[PDB]
Amino acid sequence: LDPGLQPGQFSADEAGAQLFAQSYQSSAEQVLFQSVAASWAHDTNITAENARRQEEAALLSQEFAEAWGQKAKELYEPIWQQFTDPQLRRIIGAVRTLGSANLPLAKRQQYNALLSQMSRIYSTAKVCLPTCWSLDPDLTNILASSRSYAMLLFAWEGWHNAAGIPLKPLYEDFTALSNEAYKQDGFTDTGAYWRSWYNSPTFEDDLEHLYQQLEPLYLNLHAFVRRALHRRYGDRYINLRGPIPAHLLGDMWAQSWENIYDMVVPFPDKPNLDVTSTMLQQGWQATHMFRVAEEFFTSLELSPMPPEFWEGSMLEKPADGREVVCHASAWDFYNRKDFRIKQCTRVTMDQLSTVHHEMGHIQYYLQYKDLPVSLRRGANPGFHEAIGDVLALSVSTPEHLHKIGLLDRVTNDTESDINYLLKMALEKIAFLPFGYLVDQWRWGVFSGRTPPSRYNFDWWYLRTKYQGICPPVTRNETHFDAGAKFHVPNVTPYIRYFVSFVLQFQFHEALCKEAGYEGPLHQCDIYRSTKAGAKLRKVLRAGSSRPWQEVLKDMVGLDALDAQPLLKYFQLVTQWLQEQNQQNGEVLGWPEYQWHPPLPDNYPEGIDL
Ligand SMILES: *[C@@H]1O[C@H](CO[C@@H]2O[C@@H](C)[C@@H](O)[C@@H](O)[C@@H]2O)[C@@H](O)[C@H](O)[C@H]1NC(C)=O
Ligand SMILES: *[C@@H]1O[C@H](CO[C@@H]2O[C@@H](C)[C@@H](O)[C@@H](O)[C@@H]2O)[C@@H](O)[C@H](O)[C@H]1NC(C)=O
Ligand SMILES: *[C@@H]1O[C@H](CO)[C@@H](O)[C@H](O)[C@H]1NC(C)=O
Ligand SMILES: [Cl-]
Ligand SMILES: [Mg+2]
Ligand SMILES: [Zn+2]
């Protein structure tokens, strides 16, 4: 390790630890920069050479973590836990947690290479024909817009087989090394480490209690959408008492259903709330979508995006033949200057939402960039994922869309309310079972409850139990369908999105009240409210300097996750769906749990290109 980056000498007392922490932070800045820069060069240009460079930067990061953690142990291990300063307790407790730096050199190298290779496999996989299709944009476009049973099947099967099958042996090796690493920090397994970020003894029980409250809304949305699908695909491919085939819901993972709005919309002669065709008619591009998102942030007196953001970001998929990680992300270089998005932006209404999601992450980085590096994080990971989604709730209202020239016609009547709440339910309520189940699967893999011999059997148990879907072709343990979802090979934790989907409605309700808005919660738009801005700004500036339960209390009046704001927002549509399903004679749930659809005639030969 460079002489400049090694730990010096400090006294073995709380006062010494104060000096240790400040010195620790001043070094960490330079090591973080080199890591993030190498990661950017690879994720925007996947090559064997750029992987080698990123692995070399990762190794340096591990060498730094080891040197500083050992010093914390040497000086503090028997005393830091009784330190008078809560904040200090927080940094020393982190510094003595070595993670992958606990591995011996040869295994550290093995671990870093596995990360590179899993990322490559996912982001470069394609589906070839009898020139090959990428996930983004080509397969994503098919799953969103095709109403051909056989074309949808070709895309879902091609993707799952191409991405998932080769990942399995690498994912087994990654799991074992990750657990060996975190075990030496005193965690039972890696999942116990990930859950410890919420600092709550009752986390899994509290999540289980939230889901019991939300499940009836999901079951009612599921039954009404199954019926709408039946009226299009017919009795051969839809069983009104069984699971829905996993490729027909608008999305490769069936995780949100807004792309099948046209098939589900209750009252089709009210205003058309999907504005994608208007964006295309008006000639919107990626640069327009980013500028319009920026202007929502400045309307609240939050920060614009700096020159370095515009000069360095990647806002469209490269047209030069580079392979890239298309799944969107926001980057803090840890130098208080360089902040960037990398998104393969397409011109659609759901992508405008995604732009706001990413720009939320940037705004958090701008607001806490002056805190010590160890505290440049969200209050918990759910808070970081929620910020942009909250502003997108306001943007998507019919009233806001009118203000920005995306929806000419204005109506305020009960049918128009039901259309809007149903469209928002397809986006937010359909996701809840998926946002809950992903880390239940992964926690069972890290604990050993799910060995490699049961990866796919236990994935499909969960997908059917929670989402009420079935795979549309037969699967066995050579398939690794969890591996065909970004966050699994890219080692990104998922329970943050279930947390975020609950939190965002808590935050929206609080900001709408601070704005002085007095109408129905689902019609609030906080645009141009400088008072809502100031309240959100207090959250962002806090970083991880204070317990999330306290930050939440200051913001919304309660110190806990709470489903009541979500239920209040959806109340009218919750009642309407329950009455429609009863009048229609639906069965709620999927009692014919063994059912799978038949194959199309001639499959796969009878599809044009
Ligand atoms: C598992 O499946 C492999 C791929 O075969 C395809 O998927 C299976 C589920 C069947 O539908 C089969 O008709 C398909 O062509 C098979 O190659 C394999 O031999 C099956 N068994 C094992 C152990 O992989
Ligand atoms: C839409 O209408 C909501 C309901 O308004 C109340 O009831 C209707 C029947 C009328 O009598 C009206 O004058 C009442 O105030 C309002 O709460 C809501 O603000 C309106 N929202 C928008 C965006 O126009
Ligand atoms: C992609 O990275 C390679 C290194 O493997 C480099 O030669 C090439 O110039 C890069 N391309 C771009 C467009 O940055
Ligand atoms: Cl998380
Ligand atoms: Mg979508
Ligand atoms: Zn995010």
Numbering used by the authors: 1 to 130, 135 to 613
The authors write:
We report the structural basis for the role of two lacototripeptides, Val‐Pro‐Pro and Ile‐Pro‐Pro, in domain‐specific inhibition of ACE using X‐ray crystallography and kinetic analysis. The lactotripeptides have preference for nACE due to altered polar interactions distal to the catalytic zinc ion. Elucidating the mechanism of binding and domain selectivity of these peptides also provides important insights into the functional roles of ACE.
